[PDB]
């Protein structure tokens, strides 16, 4: 049995053209009541490019990726957990940070290529299952990767509705 679990994380996907990802991301910020959010991309170059664009549209965001130093990643993450930052852009990182209660939305701006990367991004270590929502931005050409990861992880990833039920990601306490 796996250490990380997906029970408690509602998972959605949206069919996006690569040229339209930034626009779809801006639509998500506007239609969801995001407290804090974490956004994954598949390369460190795309992590920095997204973080700058996002701040240009006028959203609060830091970023950490694999080619920063570990002590620098710790302090930026500490600043983000502190509330100094609203969103955090991240590449894939082997060393995970502690859970942040204010993080209720995790977004896969770029879809991971395998199931273990997906679980390492979205899975939760504890069995308390703090309610949250994960949103995957996917191209139609890439839908077969989503089905395979869905079956391999024995989970359910649904097409995102117009209105996400806030019961599934708005903390009720």
Curated annotation (Swiss-Prot):
It is found in: Cytoplasm. Residues 8-168 form the Helicase C-terminal domain. Expression is restricted to two germline precursors Z2 and Z3 in L1 stage hermaphrodites, and is detectable specifically in the gonad at low levels into the L3 stage. Expression is significantly higher during the early L4 stage. In adults, expression remains gonad-specific and was not apparent in the somatically derived uterus. Expressed in germ granules (P granules); when associated with pgl-1. It comes from the Eukaryota. Interacts with car-1 in a germline ribonucleoprotein complex. Interacts with ifet-1. Interacts with oma-1, which is a component of a ribonucleoprotein complex, in an RNA-dependent manner. Probable RNA helicase required for oocyte and sperm function. Also required to prevent the physiological germline apoptosis mechanism killing essentially all developing oocytes. Belongs to the DEAD box helicase family. DDX6/DHH1 subfamily. This is ATP-dependent RNA helicase cgh-1. It comes from Caenorhabditis elegans. The lineage of its organism: Eukaryota, Metazoa, Ecdysozoa, Nematoda, Chromadorea. The gene is cgh-1. The chain holds residues 247 to 419 of 430 of the full protein.
